[PDB]
Design an enzyme around this catalytic site. Structure first.
Site, PDB file in Angstrom:
ATOM      1  N   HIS A  19       0.680  -1.226  -0.017  1.00 35.83           N
ATOM      2  CA  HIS A  19       0.026  -0.146  -0.030  1.00 35.83           C
ATOM      3  C   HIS A  19       0.593   1.506  -0.021  1.00 35.83           C
ATOM      4  CE1 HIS A  19      -4.040   0.327  -0.286  1.00 35.83           C
ATOM      5  NE2 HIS A  19      -4.536   0.939   1.109  1.00 35.83           N
ATOM      6  N   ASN A  66      -6.914   6.204   3.868  1.00 36.04           N
ATOM      7  CA  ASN A  66      -8.380   6.519   3.549  1.00 36.04           C
ATOM      8  C   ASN A  66      -9.106   7.836   3.539  1.00 36.04           C
ATOM      9  OD1 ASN A  66     -11.411   5.845   5.169  1.00 36.04           O
ATOM     10  ND2 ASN A  66     -11.113   5.283   3.124  1.00 36.04           N
ATOM     11  N   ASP A  91      -1.045   1.668  -5.486  1.00 37.56           N
ATOM     12  CA  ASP A  91      -0.980   0.258  -5.666  1.00 37.56           C
ATOM     13  C   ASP A  91      -2.028  -0.165  -6.286  1.00 37.56           C
ATOM     14  OD1 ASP A  91      -1.443   1.619  -3.233  1.00 37.56           O
ATOM     15  OD2 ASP A  91      -2.369  -0.572  -2.587  1.00 37.56           O
ATOM     16  N   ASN A 112      -8.986   3.028  -1.702  1.00 36.78           N
ATOM     17  CA  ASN A 112      -9.576   3.835  -0.768  1.00 36.78           C
ATOM     18  C   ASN A 112      -8.877   5.490  -0.781  1.00 36.78           C
ATOM     19  OD1 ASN A 112     -11.588   2.464  -0.094  1.00 36.78           O
ATOM     20  ND2 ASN A 112     -10.709   1.669   1.707  1.00 36.78           N
TER      21      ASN A 112
END
Length: 198
Positions: A19, A66, A91, A112
């Site tokens: 991530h 997020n 990613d 997100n």
């Protein structure tokens, strides 16, 4: 002024996690040009640096993934950046390690960080580089997989991917011709093969 955004999570335990591939690409571009994220504003680490005679804004949000858009949107507004001039690095689970896709616009594909940015900008009309990180093939949940560190075996390919994506950014900042950058850089990096693999 182009705005290069690397998506990721702040903290040492998120270093080199799947991530954070966006962060890694921006970190590579900064170290290669001897720059650093020396400013902070609206919970975004950033810097404004001249690079091939052109001022470029780099941002790594310090929100968590997020909530990425709550740093990116107001920093763009402060420096009057149009979404046209934004490129986001992140990613992609649905691309394999070695693959990158560059696009002019479109959906977050359920990522997100991209969703927070689209929501905060109020548009999906901005450039992105999706960086393949693969899917989990052994029953890991997706959250645990993306928040796990790349193995050294993964990094044999991902080092070269990082280099390839940094060059794509560098070529976009020099030329300002994204379509020409897409054509040169969409695809896969050359996989590392020894004689004994055949």
């Amino acid at each position: 002024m182009k705005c290069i955004v690397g998506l990721g999570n702040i903290g040492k335990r998120f270093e080199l996690t799947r991530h954070n591939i966006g962060f890694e690409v921006v970190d590579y571009i900064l170290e290669k040009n001897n720059f650093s994220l020396d400013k902070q504003k609206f919970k975004g680490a950033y810097t404004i640096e001249r690079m091939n005679g052109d001022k470029v804004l780099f941002i790594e949000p310090m929100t968590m993934m997020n909530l990425s858009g709550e740093a990116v949107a107001p920093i763009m507004d402060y420096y009057n950046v149009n979404p046209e001039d934004l490129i986001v690095l992140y990613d992609d689970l649905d691309l394999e390690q070695g693959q990158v896709r560059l696009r002019q616009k479109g959906s977050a594909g359920g990522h997100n960080g991209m969703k927070s940015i689209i929501k905060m900008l109020g548009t999906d009309q901005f450039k992105r580089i999706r960086i393949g990180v693969g899917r989990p093939t052994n029953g890991m949940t997706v959250p645990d997989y993306v928040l796990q560190r790349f193995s050294n075996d993964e990094m044999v390919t991902m080092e070269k991917v990082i280099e390839h994506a940094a060059r794509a950014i560098e070529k976009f900042v020099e030329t300002s011709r994204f379509d020409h950058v897409m054509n040169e850089f969409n695809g896969e990096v050359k996989l590392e093969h020894h004689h004994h693999h055949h």
